[PDB]
Design a protein around this ligand. Structure first.
Ligand SMILES: [Cl-]
Ligand SMILES: [Cl-]
Ligand SMILES: [K+]
Ligand SMILES: [Mg+2]
Ligand SMILES: [Mg+2]
Ligand SMILES: [Mg+2]
Ligand SMILES: [Mg+2]
Ligand SMILES: [Mg+2]
Ligand SMILES: [Mg+2]
Ligand SMILES: [Mg+2]
Ligand SMILES: [Mg+2]
Ligand SMILES: [Mg+2]
Ligand SMILES: [Mg+2]
Ligand SMILES: [Mg+2]
Ligand code: NA
Ligand code: NA
Ligand code: NA
Ligand code: NA
Ligand code: NA
Ligand code: NA
Ligand code: NA
Ligand code: NA
Ligand code: NA
Ligand code: NA
Ligand code: NA
Lengths: 119, 56, 46, 65, 81, 194
RNA sequence: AGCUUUACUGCAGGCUGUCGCUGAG
RNA sequence: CGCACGGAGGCGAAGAACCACAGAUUUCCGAAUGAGAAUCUCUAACAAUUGCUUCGCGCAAUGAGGAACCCCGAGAACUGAAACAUCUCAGUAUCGGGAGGAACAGAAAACGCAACGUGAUGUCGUUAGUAACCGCGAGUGAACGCGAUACAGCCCAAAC
């Protein structure tokens, strides 16, 4: 809400979550804001996910700007338990990151690209 | 009318009665509060430090 | 006045406590009820 | 006294209760006699009937009835 | 637990109710109702109770005036105790 | 590298600037319409909470408490008082609002025990603090090597006896040397002169 | 001790400026 | 077979009385908790507030008491100053909240005999009526250190 400056069209979000599920079973992913944050910092981040239904918003506010000053692409998700389930957790996740996808590099790429265009 | 003896005659009202909690005849049946143990006003028992000399 | 069942039990006990010290207790102790109350002269609680 | 602890424990749950109801009635009839100022008393036993009833009840608890 | 019947209330007035109205008077536990006083009596003496009147005495106990049915005889019942 | 938390913390060093500002202007609207004590599922200041002992686990509770801003709400004297004791307006209380908050919270949760608390802002007429309480009876805590200490009988009503962190700071126990002659080991043992 | 007042000193209260709540052109 | 030495009677060698420990029973009101009530009453009860939760009072917590002691808050006046306002009485009396058999304190953002020194904390003796405060009036009043008592040192947050 305060850290969201663009609305990710349902479909786009569905695609993204899809890529995440394969990213976990093909390559590597980081689940949890702290871990996500350290990816963007260490550069080892390709595509990061952030939930919109986070409260306190503090927990995620920094992702957007941080990712920008690191060229790391990021996308929003509506539900919190969806991003969590996608990452492969039975719990929810405020934010996850795709550390080197896998058989999704193509998709993730376009997603990153589709978002850019979504300005 | 004298405030003395003549005003004593109308005193046939009941106020303080045996208290269900402390047994003292201090339960004001109109106030439903015991002037002795505080029953009806306080869960804690009525007690003040001035009931004895400061150093005792 | 209208007495309740509880008030009545108390008045009852008071009447009983208002009895003499049995004759034998005198003998049994080689030899006074300090709680002898009168309906007129004295005044029960409540 | 006329009734002992063993004798009470030898009894069966059913026997004690029967003995109980028995005593209770003896006690009641003793008190009634006393209520009539009846002098054929033997004061030492109206006292026993009470302790006995206590014992049978005490044992009932211990035994599990 | 408390028993219903405490003991017979034997006084001249109680006698009259017995010799004249087939009524037995008892001292009962003050938590007892007429219906209970009735049962208890029918059970301890094996008789038929018609009506039971009670009073909370100035002695701290409850007095019950129990009238037996015409089949039973108050004098006879009372006599066996 | 920096922790995610470090950002929450860094943002609250200036609750009046940035997103946090916009955030507060919003939340407070909802807060001003909430009650004196509102249990909340998640700490508004995660870094602070955890830093203060918080822990996402059973038996750990959090609630936001609001207390009025300002000096003492004192009644003027109704009997003889020398000019010195005739004050009302400038008199302030010796317990800070945060300590008042910890108490109102603990009273709301009779079975719990105050672990700590922290400020989460204030509007023109009130201050909000989030209090972390602990269920000293939940086995999830009786078995926690970092919190089972609060389970001891002598920790009962710890907030009402000023054993809290905000309690001990308010009792002038921060310094171990100069200036703490009338405070340690206790205010009362020092004839109430601190 | 009660009471009074342009006795001494203060304390509520009222009025008023300023700061915070407090923001856009 | 209480104090309690009467009258009648009874219990005890089936070892009573009596004493010690353990257990049974343990009415009603009472924090008093199903609801009401001057100790009674009315038709299934953790009332109320909470935590966990099979989200069901299912599993738990709180309440009240106690001789003072202890901790956290609120806080006088007579009096002293030969009046009196700061000061003093005094953070006393009293009030609110709460813990334990003791409480509180406690492992230095210390000390500052300034050191090439001491080394968590209470407390006792001293330091000292010293330093400091004060219509610089009356009055108020430490600490470091030292000698003792007892000694004990650890756990998180975060980085990974
Ligand atoms: Cl507490
Ligand atoms: Cl030194
Ligand atoms: K004075
Ligand atoms: Mg007059
Ligand atoms: Mg008489
Ligand atoms: Mg009637
Ligand atoms: Mg001490
Ligand atoms: Mg005068
Ligand atoms: Mg009730
Ligand atoms: Mg003077
Ligand atoms: Mg002078
Ligand atoms: Mg002083
Ligand atoms: Mg010093
Ligand atoms: Mg560890
Ligand atoms: Na009288
Ligand atoms: Na009788
Ligand atoms: Na509490
Ligand atoms: Na001070
Ligand atoms: Na006067
Ligand atoms: Na007992
Ligand atoms: Na309970
Ligand atoms: Na429940
Ligand atoms: Na003088
Ligand atoms: Na004078
Ligand atoms: Na002065």
């Amino acid at each position: 809400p305060v850290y969201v400056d663009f609305d990710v069209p349902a479909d786009l979000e569905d695609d993204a979550l899809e890529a995440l599920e394969v990213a976990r079973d093909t390559g590597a992913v980081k689940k949890g804001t702290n871990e996500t944050t350290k990816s963007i910092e260490r550069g080892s981040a390709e595509l990061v996910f952030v939930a919109e239904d986070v409260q306190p918003e503090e927990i995620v506010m920094h992702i957007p700007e941080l990712a920008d000053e690191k060229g790391v692409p990021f996308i929003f998700v509506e539900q919190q338990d969806d991003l969590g389930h996608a990452a492969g957790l039975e719990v929810g996740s405020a934010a996850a990151a795709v550390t080197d996808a896998g058989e999704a590099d193509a998709d993730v790429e376009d997603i990153a690209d589709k978002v850019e265009e979504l300005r | 009318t004298g405030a003395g003896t003549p005003s004593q005659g109308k005193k046939n009202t009941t106020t303080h009665t045996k208290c269900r909690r402390c047994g003292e005849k201090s339960y004001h049946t109109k106030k439903k509060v015991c002037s002795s143990c505080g029953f009806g006003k306080s869960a804690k028992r009525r007690d003040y430090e001035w009931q004895s000399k400061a150093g005792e | 006045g209208k007495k309740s069942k509880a008030t009545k039990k108390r008045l009852a006990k008071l009447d009983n406590q208002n009895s003499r010290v049995p004759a034998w207790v005198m003998l049994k102790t080689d030899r006074r009820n300090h709680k002898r109350r009168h309906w007129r002269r004295n005044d029960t609680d409540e | 006294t006329v009734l002992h602890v063993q004798e009470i424990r030898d009894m069966t749950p059913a026997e004690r209760e029967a003995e109980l109801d028995d005593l209770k009635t003896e006690l009641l009839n003793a008190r009634a006699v006393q209520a009539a100022g009846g002098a054929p008393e033997n004061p030492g036993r109206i006292k026993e009937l009470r302790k006995a009833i206590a014992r049978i009840k005490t044992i009932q608890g211990e035994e599990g009835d | 637990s408390w028993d219903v019947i405490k003991h017979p209330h034997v006084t001249e007035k109680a006698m009259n109710d017995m010799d004249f109205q087939n009524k037995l008077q008892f001292a009962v536990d003050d938590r007892a109702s007429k219906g209970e006083v009735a049962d208890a009596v029918e059970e301890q003496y094996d008789v038929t109770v018609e009506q039971v009147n009670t009073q909370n005495t100035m002695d701290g106990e409850k007095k019950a005036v129990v009238r037996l049915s015409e089949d039973d005889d108050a004098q006879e019942v009372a006599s066996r105790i | 590298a920096r922790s995610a938390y470090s950002y929450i913390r860094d943002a609250w060093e200036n609750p009046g600037d940035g997103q946090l500002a916009e955030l507060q202007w919003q939340r407070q609207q909802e807060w001003r319409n909430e009650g004196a004590v509102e249990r909340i599922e998640r700490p508004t200041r995660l870094d602070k909470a955890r830093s203060q002992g918080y822990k996402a686990k059973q038996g750990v509770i959090v609630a936001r408490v609001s207390v009025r801003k300002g000096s003492a709400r004192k009644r003027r004297h109704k009997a003889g008082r020398r000019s010195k004791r005739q004050g009302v307006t400038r008199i302030t209380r010796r317990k800070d609002i945060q300590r008042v908050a910890e108490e109102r919270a603990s009273r709301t949760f009779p079975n719990l025990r105050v672990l700590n608390s922290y400020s989460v802002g204030q509007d023109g007429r009130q201050k909000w603090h989030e209090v972390i309480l602990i269920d000293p009876n939940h086995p999830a805590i009786q078995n926690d090597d970092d919190l089972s200490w609060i389970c001891a009988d002598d920790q009962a009503d710890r907030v009402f006896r000023g054993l809290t962190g905000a309690g001990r700071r308010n009792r002038g126990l921060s310094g171990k040397g100069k200036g703490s002659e009338k405070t340690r080991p206790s205010l009362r043992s020092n004839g109430g002169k601190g």
